[PDB]
Amino acid sequence: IQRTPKIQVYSRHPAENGKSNFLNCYVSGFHPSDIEVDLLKNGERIEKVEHSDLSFSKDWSFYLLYYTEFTPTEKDEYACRVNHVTLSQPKIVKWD
Amino acid sequence: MRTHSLRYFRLGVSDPIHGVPEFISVGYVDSHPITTYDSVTRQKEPRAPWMAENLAPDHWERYTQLLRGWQQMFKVELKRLQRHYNHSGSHTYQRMIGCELLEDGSTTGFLQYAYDGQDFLIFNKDTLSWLAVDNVAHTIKQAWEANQHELLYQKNWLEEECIAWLKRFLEYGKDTLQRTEPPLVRVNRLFCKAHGFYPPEIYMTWMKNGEEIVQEIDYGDILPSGDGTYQAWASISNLYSCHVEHSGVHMVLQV
Ligand SMILES: *[C@@H](C)/C=N/c1c(NC[C@H](O)[C@H](O)[C@H](O)CO)[nH]c(=O)[nH]c1=O
């Protein structure tokens, strides 16, 4: 019995183009703990990406938050790429 | 005061990947990590500045030794479970201990174990017994229930010790844990969105002509914003209004 991660991609503050913010990717409800998370900018992986330590839910599943400082623009497309034993291929979730 | 809680988790992994620790134990006061321990660092370390500032090296030194022991115990207990399950490969073992101090002054205490992320053994501190999910859990239940004094010890820890630690940690973290940051709520095309609030506990709903109908509503998760605050949403001729409840303040946004 393995649980697939829920992936949520949102900004810290309501986004305004040209205004510095943080892009968050909240990965949760997954089991087992082994997980790979990458933040993408125009399909390419972002190097300066920070994350929380693996966290524990009362339902026995785990969660983490991956974030990067960014200045949204009309042109730039952002996404969160996740891999877990429950996934055949890595899952790319786009930011609205 | 609002409802507060103290929880400690333990995670044991048999056969881990290169790097991944065999054992991790983390403590929380509500949504806040307070302490951490793993089989790689082999040290109990603070996860909140108000824990670091309020507990002397002696505390961290003592508990580092206890966690080294608790780590070994978890290895042996997982070995027993995997053998009796007759399982191969990497399997998980988890423990969650904790308590809550409710707004009314009443308390709760809990202790449970899981194998492969599923409920395995659940302690009942009122009947001093362990609820077993299957025969492997039933074999362990009989062994733990044969040590009557440990069940008594556990009842006392959950009811007395745990509460005292929680009250102590609440005072240390008061500026963080007892504060209120009201939400900023907006309605857009229908989406009701809130952000910048603390504590994470909020209720958001949509009313169609002053009647709820919770089935016709899609609720978003309470998500960490990354700055110590949270965000959430709820989506849906009739009159629609968004209702937001946070720390004893009710809010209405008419559309
Ligand atoms: C620092 C105090 C870390 N403690 C810690 C504990 N402590 C709680 C309690 O004494 C313990 O759970 C006993 O087993 C209860 O009978 N527990 C834990 O799982 N992790 C910790 O890091």
Swiss-Prot record, chain A:
<dbReference type="GO" id="GO:0016020">
    <property type="term" value="C:membrane"/>
</dbReference>
<dbReference type="GO" id="GO:0042824">
    <property type="term" value="C:MHC class I peptide loading complex"/>
</dbReference>
<dbReference type="GO" id="GO:0042612">
    <property type="term" value="C:MHC class I protein complex"/>
</dbReference>
<dbReference type="GO" id="GO:0009897">
    <property type="term" value="C:external side of plasma membrane"/>
</dbReference>
<keyword id="KW-0490">MHC I</keyword>
<dbReference type="GO" id="GO:0006879">
    <property type="term" value="P:intracellular iron ion homeostasis"/>
</dbReference>
<comment type="function">
    <text>Component of the class I major histocompatibility complex (MHC). Involved in the presentation of peptide antigens to the immune system. Exogenously applied M.tuberculosis EsxA or EsxA-EsxB (or EsxA expressed in host) binds B2M and decreases its export to the cell surface (total protein levels do not change), probably leading to defects in class I antigen presentation.</text>
</comment>
<comment type="subunit">
    <text>Heterodimer of an alpha chain and a beta chain. Beta-2-microglobulin is the beta-chain of major histocompatibility complex class I molecules. Polymers of beta 2-microglobulin can be found in tissues from patients on long-term hemodialysis. B2M alone (not in complex with HLA-I) interacts with M.tuberculosis EsxA (ESAT-6) and an EsxA-EsxB (CFP-10) complex; the tripartite complex can be detected in the host endoplasmic reticulum. The B2M-EsxA complex can be detected in patients with pleural tuberculosis and is stable from pH 4.0 to 8.0 and in the presence of 2M NaCl.</text>
</comment>
<feature type="glycosylation site" description="N-linked (Glc) (glycation) lysine; in vitro">
    <location>
        <position position="48"/>
    </location>
</feature>
<keyword id="KW-0391">Immunity</keyword>
<dbReference type="GO" id="GO:0031902">
    <property type="term" value="C:late endosome membrane"/>
</dbReference>
<dbReference type="GO" id="GO:0050680">
    <property type="term" value="P:negative regulation of epithelial cell proliferation"/>
</dbReference>
<dbReference type="GO" id="GO:0005198">
    <property type="term" value="F:structural molecule activity"/>
</dbReference>
<dbReference type="GO" id="GO:0002481">
    <property type="term" value="P:antigen processing and presentation of exogenous protein antigen via MHC class Ib, TAP-dependent"/>
</dbReference>
<dbReference type="GO" id="GO:1990000">
    <property type="term" value="P:amyloid fibril formation"/>
</dbReference>
<dbReference type="GO" id="GO:0005925">
    <property type="term" value="C:focal adhesion"/>
</dbReference>
<dbReference type="GO" id="GO:1904724">
    <property type="term" value="C:tertiary granule lumen"/>
</dbReference>
<dbReference type="GO" id="GO:0002726">
    <property type="term" value="P:positive regulation of T cell cytokine production"/>
</dbReference>
<dbReference type="GO" id="GO:0071281">
    <property type="term" value="P:cellular response to iron ion"/>
</dbReference>
<dbReference type="GO" id="GO:0031901">
    <property type="term" value="C:early endosome membrane"/>
</dbReference>
<dbReference type="GO" id="GO:0005783">
    <property type="term" value="C:endoplasmic reticulum"/>
</dbReference>
<dbReference type="GO" id="GO:0005615">
    <property type="term" value="C:extracellular space"/>
</dbReference>
Swiss-Prot record, chain B:
<dbReference type="GO" id="GO:0000139">
    <property type="term" value="C:Golgi membrane"/>
</dbReference>
<dbReference type="GO" id="GO:0005615">
    <property type="term" value="C:extracellular space"/>
</dbReference>
<keyword id="KW-0812">Transmembrane</keyword>
<dbReference type="GO" id="GO:0030881">
    <property type="term" value="F:beta-2-microglobulin binding"/>
</dbReference>
<dbReference type="GO" id="GO:0045087">
    <property type="term" value="P:innate immune response"/>
</dbReference>
<dbReference type="GO" id="GO:0031902">
    <property type="term" value="C:late endosome membrane"/>
</dbReference>
<keyword id="KW-1003">Cell membrane</keyword>
<dbReference type="GO" id="GO:0009897">
    <property type="term" value="C:external side of plasma membrane"/>
</dbReference>
<feature type="binding site" description="covalent">
    <location>
        <position position="44"/>
    </location>
    <ligand>
        <name>pyridoxal</name>
    </ligand>
</feature>
<feature type="binding site">
    <location>
        <position position="95"/>
    </location>
    <ligand>
        <name>5-(2-oxoethylideneamino)-6-(D-ribitylamino)uracil</name>
    </ligand>
</feature>
<keyword id="KW-0325">Glycoprotein</keyword>
<feature type="region of interest" description="Alpha-3">
    <location>
        <begin position="181"/>
        <end position="255"/>
    </location>
</feature>
<feature type="binding site">
    <location>
        <position position="95"/>
    </location>
    <ligand>
        <name>7-hydroxy-6-methyl-8-(1-D-ribityl)lumazine</name>
    </ligand>
</feature>
<feature type="binding site">
    <location>
        <position position="59"/>
    </location>
    <ligand>
        <name>8-(9H-purin-6-yl)-2-oxa-8-azabicyclo[3.3.1]nona-3,6-diene-4,6-dicarbaldehyde</name>
    </ligand>
</feature>
<feature type="binding site" description="covalent">
    <location>
        <position position="44"/>
    </location>
    <ligand>
        <name>5-(2-oxopropylideneamino)-6-(D-ribitylamino)uracil</name>
    </ligand>
</feature>
<keyword id="KW-0732">Signal</keyword>
<keyword id="KW-1133">Transmembrane helix</keyword>
<feature type="disulfide bond">
    <location>
        <begin position="99"/>
        <end position="162"/>
    </location>
</feature>
<keyword id="KW-0399">Innate immunity</keyword>
<dbReference type="GO" id="GO:0042608">
    <property type="term" value="F:T cell receptor binding"/>
</dbReference>
<keyword id="KW-0256">Endoplasmic reticulum</keyword>
<feature type="binding site">
    <location>
        <position position="10"/>
    </location>
    <ligand>
        <name>5-(2-oxopropylideneamino)-6-(D-ribitylamino)uracil</name>
    </ligand>
</feature>
